[PDB]
Design a protein around this ligand. Structure first.
Ligand code: GTP
Ligand code: GTP
Ligand code: GDP
Ligand code: GDP
Ligand code: MG
Ligand code: MG
Lengths: 431, 437, 119, 431, 437
């Protein structure tokens, strides 16, 4: 029984975790109270992956929600699928953090680290065979950066072998949505480099673009934006809880994507992706799914995939389909796109087809790209970090509780170092 | 007396076994719950099932199969499936976490905790038997459990059983298609660790059967189930001689001694004929000459590899069905006199024939129509030199700048044995090209 | 480029599309000239019909001529009367003279059958 | 199989193609709500030549509607059969440019050319073996003569081996029809010369003469003229949609149509056009059918065929008939009116028979005649263009758009070369 | 022990095939499904179908035909028609796009894509063959598939099979009736490229068939159905000696040696008699002399050439039904005592006759009447020189200033091939003249 522990950090973390738990409970047929309100018995065979059995028929999720303010805790508790969580797992502070990496990593939240680690140990030691930890934080903010990175560091120090993935939300190319976001983005990704094993960089701006151009959605509201990321969640974790023809777990995805250990920043994707109107006028097959898979208006990261090169692409398919077609189309996209993929690594596609398609859909696809286009985000945040560190913008309200400048120096050093390996392995000649 | 021990390792191998035991059960008339049906075999039963199924005192038939996989999904699916009561519940061995396309995980870290129980059950099955013929090991070259655990298992059986024959059924990587990315790594590693203990390994490619399903069987959407059914028909055709009777009966003990010239080139192929569907099978002469001609076609091998740039080193025919042996001799004479089919200069003798009386059996819910004749053709041709060379070139491109090596060096294998396997496959390729002189 | 003008032009276009213009089609329908087959279910899978579909596939593969009483495009008229008028007793040697082979001939027909294959 | 994509361009194109899809959907038995309701089995033989498959037994037309103002496509997607198309194929421009070739070609039209070519590639790579492109417009205005020619040029340089037919509504011998029309027609037929493997010239005044000299039409309106155009524009490709004794597709007609590449301007015509009162006093046979074919009144381009010589004629019959009678009538007309056919081309008739008639109309026929009499139209357009071009009239719009007089002069050079070519092949002798 | 492979190319091949195979099936008792029913089977014999069918399955007869065309519709009607079960589905070969009345399209482009497939199918049919006497290839000179890909078939079959003979049934473009305009180009091209390859090409004018159908058959409303039905009767009267015992039996290799005097002079002219209708056959007294002179009439000749404008080089008469060789010889003697029937002086004996006992069977729903005797004369007169001089002239008017030449020269032919074909036809016309003097 493969086991994953789910953790939420900050306002963004709690919101995306709530949407993920709502979607996965709808998939598994679990009502907000806890009783299995479903039809088939196939969804109970692997229900222990994301649920823990209680007295009676209740299935409590293994979620370790963290915040430094009780406001988002009250919001997620009052909202739907909020009473399903264990009330002993809501760990919240009182002082306050949420935009400052020092406030979320060295003080204030540093007191809550012991309690969160205690809850993490209690939930991860109730597992039969632990596999990994999914943190749904957001870099560039506060506790999504500070608390998230400190928890990742502590869990990686305690459990050096289990797989570890984050679903961090990167800063948008335009706007800022936070002034000290260039500071906290580097200060979080520095710890994300040598601790995590997978990081699925999701972008708000590309989420807006895919909600507007493809999904139409005249009002974008807010539920659909996190619903897409929750669809990416359930798509990428399908093989651990559903049977299929080709099964690829988190460790198989780990050994398939990342070639060299500090190259594990992946671009998510989801591609039945039908519009409000053009859904009867559209035929969903493997050709149409693959056309949406390998399309720049579908990869929900900010970086343009035309720049750089594709190191590798995963293709998690859900539904009942044919292996010959889902194989020959991943052949022919590589045949059509010569220079887009790397030539020194032949056939950069890992397919995995599983049965039991999601609710209200025939077939489904989950794009995961490890292209070298992601160096643009690293370059741009390095540019803002240099631009503000040359004049010490916002620096004294970091140094007020410690924070000597050496942390910034060999944070920026690794920050540009990762840009250096991305540039070096982007367009290297094979032989 | 003439028996088999079938070890199904990896997800691909368990899928092969899922098709294979359905075919075996339908051949021998067993029910899916393991019981022989009532009001049949009133004359005292039959000794046909003794090759595959052991007989207990309850009237149920226990197969001589060891299902094993480190991932607890496909084996658990078998355990909860229709063939739940047929299998021995303690033969359905399964792990807790998979190797996940890692040879190091399949061979050192995760696989070493389960090879112990697998050897225990293989010894139990061998001791509860008379006159062991060989081991049918169904796996794949995709890797993880397919490569690392199968290699470790075969290494452990080498010191245990020795002289016993080990027939392997592996799915070779396709010439243009690879699902995993570390397939060059795990194929080179499993070839290095199976060059010394294997006796005869059949590679059955995937996109080759895809093309066969497109052309002959006339289906545009072939899943894995059709491929497993065709491989099940291949293994039923090769093991029909141990269960039925007729003309020359070819045993598992010794088609390996009539197919392997030197103890490094134990890598033949497989080809079924006719693989034709119902409507197209209705409108033709199913005759010995044309079925042998279809066997000797470049668009009917189960591996996509043209048999024109290589020479047939040796070949074995199995005529399952009402085949008169004079037509067999006339057919093999026609192929031997025809051009573009070449044999090596040390090959005036290059064919071994085995003809049975039992026709092939159709599975319900399949696509192949039942026909009165079939040929299972095993060619140990030297045409696979190009495939071995491009896999060597892929491994060179991978290892030239140390891609996907940190996993192996972290939890297992090293660069030194990587270089050792590199020079071992160089030796295998130079012997393979030294043969054809 | 002015952004809000771009988005609300797209908004006006969209609300003109998803105004009252969707029909929500009330007929599945069958086109009996394409065929697809992708189940090929697992043997262990225990978790896995239409009389109108049987009728339409029968009229698709019903050997046309029996489904219409009056003909169609004249390639479906050239063979409209395949039944030979009069009983036409073919065993009558007086009327019909078919060439009948003999056991002296069939044997050596079989003899040069594999001789002629390498002419 | 064979398949064609239809490419409405402009006000005229978006009206004629809409009536065309109405007519061909009524022929193939398709309701406005995109489902089969016909009673004949042969309708669903070659749906794929004009339609793409959509889920739930749906047929969506392979049509692209292009305009540089939203109102035309808004009117199209308002009435019957307006909701049969893919809503993503409606490509709009919020600029204008309705009657200026320059501003429709090298200006705000040329920002939409990328989108319309993207839709063209999407509709053209989703089929097994593409045959050609049919595109409908008029030779006057900005959205149907600049957009059309630029789109044809781009598709010709992208996919050069496919057949290309355009149906252009050429101007009238009398009256005006949108005063800068001689300009637009001149440097629109300029790009029609190199591209457009075959072009169908349709005259509005000839259409009005057809509706009221033979068909009565006491209230003839606009959709009836569009019906008259669409009948022949569907009957050209009836050999692709229905089997016959002798079929002839677009490539067959193009090969046996033009002796020389710059001669692809034809005159369409439909045979069984008769009034409702005179329907009773009629006997629909091959003689009267070809009698109303070889008919200067029923030509939809005015350009009287007895003022020149026919180069090649073509007949596409539809219905139950005898081709002894068909070949005998073509033999009789060629034997009688021998002076109107070029004598260096013996037997300059291509006849084909498809035995599937339309709704009603027990037999029908479509005439396509390539003659030397279109030199009257070209000479008229040249004379009007020179009259409005000599005293620098109506040119400051084009020059301020960014063009220059050298393009206009070489446009007249190409047009006068075309006129000289028709005159030379008109008066050429055998030996 | 004898057969002949029929290859039907183009629309004019496959519609003539639809007429031919219904004639053969209705003549031999084959039901359209392919099963010989009750009241048709006779005990221990009736091997007349072996020359065009092959016994297959458990009582099925499948024809030895390859239906090829580059375009759909006219072939998938056969795939979904009355005879949808008679033909092997791999014998009904179609392409994607059409040759567009272009010899360049048929020969140097997409026509040279399915050529490997059709030669593979022909090789498989000749493997199933039990003694081949030739290939009956059905086409029109016409345009496109009947010229380019048919000439490619001539080239490939000549370089592959060699000694085996190829009889063509070729539909000539009429003098006055035409349905295309590039057919003077296509006819000269395919004549130049199949002159060296064809063994004997029987020439047919549609206009002459319409003339005889309106005059004798009393069909004021004829069509391609009647035309191909009558052509099917002609080819059935050719091949009746391979199927039925007769006083004089003449096969394909005898027919070719008796007809052609020179290896380039191999274009004979066929006529059939009687073509009398059912209503007018009551008042006639059909006899050998009055059908021999009816064949020698200059109105039943099936290419619009009066034989008065030339000399008869040779003549082959094929009689079917109640025909006695005494009346055959009396009719031949009367024809020789006629003065205007001019034979060449260097060929004193000019008749090769054959008599078969089986009368020509008629298809219900057709227009021909049932008669007790019929003649199938295939004379080799010099009157075809006038027709080909006429079509050389029609080529010359179009080629005077390069009409419909840009298609060919842009899609792959060079300019010089047209001149080479024209001078080849000029040399052949001079050959006709110098033989005829
Ligand atoms: N013919 C056939 N091949 C299969 C099937 N399932 C998987 N494969 C092949 O197996 C390859 C993937 O590697 P696997 O052998 O499945 O690896 P595994 O057996 O799952 O072992 P682990 O990855 O460690 O769990 C693919 O390239 C497929 O070609 C199957 O059901 N039928
Ligand atoms: N007698 C007879 N002639 C036919 C028939 N069908 C076509 N033809 C002849 O064929 C000629 C046209 O050339 P085809 O051989 O049909 O060309 P095609 O087979 O259609 O090949 P493509 O032109 O590439 O489509 C016409 O002149 C007709 O005389 C038929 O059914 N009976
Ligand atoms: N999806 C999502 N993203 C958010 C949310 N809140 C903030 N973000 C993104 O995260 C960045 C700042 O995060 P922040 O509000 O400081 O997270 P906090 O530490 O929990 O307060 C901004 O650039 C936003 O784009 C949220 O509730 N949901
Ligand atoms: N036959 C026919 N002619 C039309 C139609 N629509 C427009 N026209 C002619 O086209 C001329 C003007 O074309 P226009 O609408 O300006 O084309 P645009 O510039 O692309 O919008 C008018 O004089 C009409 O006579 C139509 O539906 N049928
Ligand atoms: Mg596995
Ligand atoms: Mg044709």
């Amino acid at each position: 029984m493969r086991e994953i522990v789910h953790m939420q950090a900050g306002q963004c973390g709690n919101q995306i975790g709530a949407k993920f738990w709502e979607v996965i409970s709808d998939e598994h047929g679990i009502d907000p109270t806890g009783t299995y309100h479903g039809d088939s018995d196939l969804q109970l065979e692997r229900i222990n992956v994301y649920y823990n059995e209680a007295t009676g028929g209740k299935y409590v999720p293994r979620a370790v929600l963290v915040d430094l303010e009780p406001g988002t805790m009250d919001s997620v508790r009052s909202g739907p699928f909020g009473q399903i969580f264990r009330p002993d797992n809501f760990v919240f502070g009182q002082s306050g953090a949420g935009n400052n990496w020092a406030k979320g990593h060295y003080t204030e939240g540093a007191e809550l680290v012991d309690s969160v680690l205690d809850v993490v140990r209690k939930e991860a030691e109730s597992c039969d065979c632990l596999q990994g930890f999914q943190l749904t934080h957001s870099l560039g903010g506060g506790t999504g950066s500070g608390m998230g990175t400190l928890l990742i560091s502590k869990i990686r120090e305690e459990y050096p072998d289990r797989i570890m993935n984050t679903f961090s939300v990167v800063p948008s190319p335009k706007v800022s949505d936070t002034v000290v976001e260039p500071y906290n983005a580097t200060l979080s990704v520095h710890q994300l480099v040598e601790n995590t094993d997978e990081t699925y960089c999701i972008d708000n701006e590309a989420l807006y673009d895919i909600c507007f151009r493809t999904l139409k959605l005249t009002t974008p509201t807010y539920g659909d934006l996190n619903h897409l990321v929750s669809a990416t969640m359930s798509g990428v974790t399908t093989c651990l809880r559903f049977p299929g023809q080709l099964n690829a777990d988190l460790r198989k995805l780990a050994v398939n994507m990342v070639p060299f250990p500090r190259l594990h920043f992946f671009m998510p994707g989801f591609a039945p992706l039908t519009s409000r109107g053009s859904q009867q006028y559209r035929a969903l097959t493997v050709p149409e799914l693959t056309q949406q898979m390998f399309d720049a208006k579908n990869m929900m990261a900010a970086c343009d995939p035309r720049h750089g090169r594709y190191l590798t692409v995963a293709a998690i398919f859900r539904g009942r389909m044919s292996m010959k077609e889902v194989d020959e189309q991943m052949l022919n996209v590589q045949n059509k796109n010569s220079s887009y993929f790397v030539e020194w690594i032949p056939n950069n596609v890992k397919t995995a087809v599983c049965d039991i398609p999601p609710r209200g859909l025939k077939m489904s696809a989950t794009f995961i790209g490890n292209s070298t286009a992601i160096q643009e985000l690293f370059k741009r945040i390095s540019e803002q970090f240099t631009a503000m560190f040359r004049r010490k913008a916002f620096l004294h309200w970091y140094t007020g509780e410690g924070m000597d400048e050496m942390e910034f120096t060999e944070a920026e050093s690794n920050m540009n170092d990762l840009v250096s390996e991305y540039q070096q392995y982007q367009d290297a000649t094979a032989e | 007396m003439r028996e088999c021990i079938s070890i199904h390792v990896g997800q691909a191998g368990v899928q092969i076994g899922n098709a294979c035991w359905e075919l075996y059960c339908l051949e021998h008339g067993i029910q899916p719950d393991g019981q022989m049906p009532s009001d049949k075999t009133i004359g005292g039963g039959d000794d046909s099932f003794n090759t595959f199924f052991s007989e207990t005192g309850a009237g149920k038939h226990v197969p001589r199969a060891v299902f094993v996989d480190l991932e607890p999904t496909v084996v658990d699916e078998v355990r909860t499936g229709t063939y739940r009561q047929l299998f021995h519940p303690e033969q359905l061995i399964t792990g807790k976490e998979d190797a996940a396309n890692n040879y190091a995980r399949g061979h050192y870290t995760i696989g070493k905790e389960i090879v112990d129980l697998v050897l225990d059950r293989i010894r139990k099955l061998a001791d509860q038997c008379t006159g062991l013929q060989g081991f049918l090991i169904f796996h794949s070259f995709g890797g993880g459990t397919g490569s690392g655990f199968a290699s470790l298992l075969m290494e452990r059986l080498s010191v245990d059983y020795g002289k016993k024959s080990k027939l392997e059924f592996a799915i070779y990587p396709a010439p243009q298609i690879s699902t995993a990315v570390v397939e060059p790594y795990n194929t080179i590693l499993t070839t290095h660790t199976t060059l010394e203990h294997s006796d005869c390994a059949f590679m059955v490619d995937n996109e080759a059967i895809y093309d066969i399903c497109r052309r002959n069987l006339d289906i545009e959407r072939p899943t894995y189930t059709n491929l497993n059914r065709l491989i099940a028909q291949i293994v039923s055709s090769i093991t029909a001689s141990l269960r039925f009777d007729g003309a020359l009966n070819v045993d598992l003990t010794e088609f390996q001694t009539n197919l392997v010239p030197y103890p490094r080139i134990h890598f033949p192929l497989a080809t079924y004929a006719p693989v034709i569907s119902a409507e197209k099978a209705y409108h033709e002469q199913l005759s010995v000459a044309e079925i042998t001609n279809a066997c000797f076609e470049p668009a009917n091998q189960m591996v996509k590899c043209d048999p024109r740039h290589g020479k047939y080193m040796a070949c074995c025919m199995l005529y399952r069905g009402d085949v008169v042996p004079k037509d067999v001799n006339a057919a093999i004479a026609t192929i031997k006199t025809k051009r573009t089919i070449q044999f090596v200069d040390w090959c005036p003798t290059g064919f071994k024939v085995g003809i049975n009386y039992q026709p092939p059996t159709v599975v319900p819910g399949g696509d192949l129509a039942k026909v009165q004749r079939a040929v299972c053709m095993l060619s140990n041709t030297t045409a696979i030199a190009e495939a071995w060379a491009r896999l060597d070139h892929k491994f060179d491109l991978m290892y030239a700048k140390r891609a996907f090596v940190h996993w192996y060096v972290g939890e297992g294998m090293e660069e030194g044995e990587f270089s050792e396997a590199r020079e071992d496959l160089a030796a295998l390729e130079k012997d393979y090209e030294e043969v054809g002189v | 480029p002015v952004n809000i003008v771009h988005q609300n032009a797209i908004l006006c276009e969209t609300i003109k599309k998803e105004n009252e213009c969707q029909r929500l089609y009330t007929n599945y329908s069958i086109n009996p000239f394409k065929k697809m087959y992708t189940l090929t279910g697992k043997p262990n899978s225990l978790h896995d019909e239409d009389d109108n579909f049987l009728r339409i596939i029968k009229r698709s593969t019903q050997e046309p001529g029996k489904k219409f009483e009056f003909p169609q495009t004249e390639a479906q008229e050239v063979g409209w009367y395949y039944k030979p008028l009069l009983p036409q007793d073919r065993g009558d040697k007086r009327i019909h003279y078919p060439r009948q082979n003999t056991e002296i001939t069939k044997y050596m027909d079989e003899a040069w059958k594999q001789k002629e294959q390498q002419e």
